[PDB]
Amino acid sequence: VDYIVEYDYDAVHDDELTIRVGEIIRNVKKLQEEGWLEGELNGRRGMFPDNFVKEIK
């Protein structure tokens, strides 16, 4: 599953992604940690908030 970024988000830890509107995050996994996803952007995997993105269906 891929997601599209709907709202900008700035990483506040090194394991998070910084994401910008329009970007596509690839191969997204829903985490145990509620509200968070893990996925690949610019060839790097990291965590990002689920309410800043929309699942591409």
Binding site: Y7, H13, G35, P49, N51, F52
Partner: peptide
């Protein structure tokens, strides 16, 4: 550290 559920 814990992470919040960030708000737009």
């Amino acid at each position: 550290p814990p992470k919040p559920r960030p708000r737009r």
